[PDB]
Design a protein around this ligand. Structure first.
Ligand SMILES: COc1[nH]c2ccc(F)cc2c1C(=O)OCC1CCN(CCNS(=O)(=O)c2ccccc2)CC1
Length: 327
């Protein structure tokens, strides 16, 4: 069967924590008062929740209310525990309250407001400097949550809120986040299609924090090459083919061999044989100002099939690509 894997960093953070830290099912929710909030407008509705711009009538501050759909109400204690554990961390959204919705009784999470847009609205219009700057800010959030024993598992541009005017960023939507426990097999149906790492696509369950680093690499490729999304798969199988057309098939097969991964027989008739491509192939006159040897070297060290071979968030922060960012 599959060869086991463990994170190369922050491996045992949860083993040394009291059970209260990671045993979310044991957590007692000290519920707040639904009447303290006034809903202004619907910011959007996904398949798992509804988000609203709101006002806390007890202190007159603008908040954001996220009401969980009956389906996604099951692991509310997990999201609460993770949000409470990470509260005050750099670039992490701050959970202000947890209330029950009045008409549906489903839990509603209350967050501090973020004044400007979604990162997907901005990330295709940024300068080279701003790409570097905002990548570094995301890395601060990822290193913090990984250091706290938590994998985000849904890193994507829609989950990064950017206040471009104040040059501030928040990583949001911790609904898929999970505690890392070495040796645990996790559900591979996490992250959005275009940001899923190859470990999810080949059904390798013993993944770790490095999944978020693949997703961040997809975001970086999209930004520096002005190609959204960078890996445009039609479904989860074609997603792996899109990746293999760039990274090649030799390294994919070396990866499945290393971990004794059983490849779905449907991949034999669609993967084919592909050459490991040079990142300069995606460089054109309209994006050349966003590309540098440092950007390509950094991207190359994120987008690796082998999850153990990717840069960690702290190693990524050390990369020369960020030397030009004021710290
Ligand atoms: C006193 O004023 C309020 N205070 C709140 C505090 C939290 C909150 F969730 C809603 C309110 C709230 C209010 O006006 O709520 C009105 C609606 C807001 C939406 N809910 C839930 C809708 N049903 S649902 O199944 O929970 C759902 C459907 C679709 C997406 C996500 C969840 C029904 C009542």
């Amino acid at each position: 069967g599959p060869v086991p894997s463990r994170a190369r960093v922050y491996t045992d953070v949860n083993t040394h924590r009291p059970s209260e830290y990671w045993d979310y099912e044991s957590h007692v929710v000290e519920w707040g008062n639904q009447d303290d909030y006034q809903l202004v407008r619907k910011l959007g509705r996904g398949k798992y929740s509804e988000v609203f711009e709101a006002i806390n009538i007890t202190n007159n501050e603008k908040v954001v209310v996220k009401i969980l759909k009956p389906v996604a109400a099951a692991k509310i204690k997990r999201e609460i525990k993770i949000l409470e554990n990470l509260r005050g961390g750099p670039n992490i959204i701050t959970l202000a309250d947890i209330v029950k919705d009045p008409v549906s009784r489903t839990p509603a999470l209350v967050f501090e407001h973020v004044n400007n847009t979604d990162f997907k609205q901005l990330y295709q219009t940024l300068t080279d400097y701003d790409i570097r700057f905002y990548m570094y800010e995301i890395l601060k959030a990822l290193d913090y949550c990984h250091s706290m024993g938590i994998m985000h598992r849904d890193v994507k541009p829609h989950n990064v809120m950017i206040d471009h005017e104040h040059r501030k960023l928040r990583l949001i939507d911790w609904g898929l986040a999970e505690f890392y426990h070495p040796g645990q097999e996790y559900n591979v149906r996490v992250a959005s299609r275009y940001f899923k790492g190859p470990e999810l696509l080949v059904d390798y369950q013993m993944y770790d924090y490095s999944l978020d680093m693949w997703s961040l690499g997809c975001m970086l490729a999209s930004m520096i090459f002005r190609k959204e999304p960078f890996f445009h798969g039609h479904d989860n199988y074609d997603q792996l083919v899109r990746i293999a057309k760039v990274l090649g098939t030799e390294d994919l097969y070396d990866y499945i061999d290393k971990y004794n991964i059983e490849l779905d027989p449907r991949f034999n008739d669609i993967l084919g044989r592909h050459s490991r491509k040079r990142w300069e192939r995606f460089v054109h006159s309209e994006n050349q100002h966003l590309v540098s040897p440092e950007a390509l070297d950094f991207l190359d060290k994120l987008l690796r099939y082998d999850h153990q071979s990717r840069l960690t968030a702290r190693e990524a922060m050390e990369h020369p690509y960020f030397y030009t960012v004021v710290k």
